[PDB]
């Protein structure tokens, strides 16, 4: 069994084993929701002594729907607090 | 699928239901312990018009454990307030 908690922190690769295990209900989200994060930014030279970083592609989870800019909808939506 | 909530004020076949559940692995008893009370209680007559009320037996759950008066512990321990 798995238990995977987030929560408004969590970014890019915290991410994708957040919703690979979602949408394979392999674990059980619980928290708020992600940051939304999921895009690459390559880094390639421009002039002799500059270059550009952009945004080139951005990877879905397993269903086809994407994290940006939505992110992971916890299944036990719990904000923190004193027990 | 089952979710079986008990508090501090249930007892008397309010543990039956939720005791057996326990044990067979039907159900997460979910609350606060229990008041344990587990007891037969019957008035049989010892005189021409007098009688004695004696308890004789209780009732343990499937397992083989007493209510009285351990009462039923529930697996995921919480109290009442505002989330």
């Given at each position: 069994p798995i238990a995977?908690?987030?929560n408004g922190g969590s970014a890019?690769?915290?991410e994708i084993v957040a919703?690979?295990?979602?949408d394979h209900k392999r674990?059980?989200?619980?928290g708020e929701k992600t940051f939304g994060k999921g895009s690459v930014q390559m880094?390639?030279?421009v002039n002799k002594d500059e270059?550009?970083?952009?945004?080139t592609a951005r990877y879905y989870l397993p269903s086809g729907r994407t994290i940006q800019a939505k992110g992971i909808?916890?299944?036990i939506v719990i904000y923190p607090g004193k027990v």
């Open positions: 995977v908690l987030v890019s690769a915290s919703g690979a295990l979602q674990a059980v989200i619980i880094l390639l030279p270059a550009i970083k952009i945004t909808t916890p299944d």
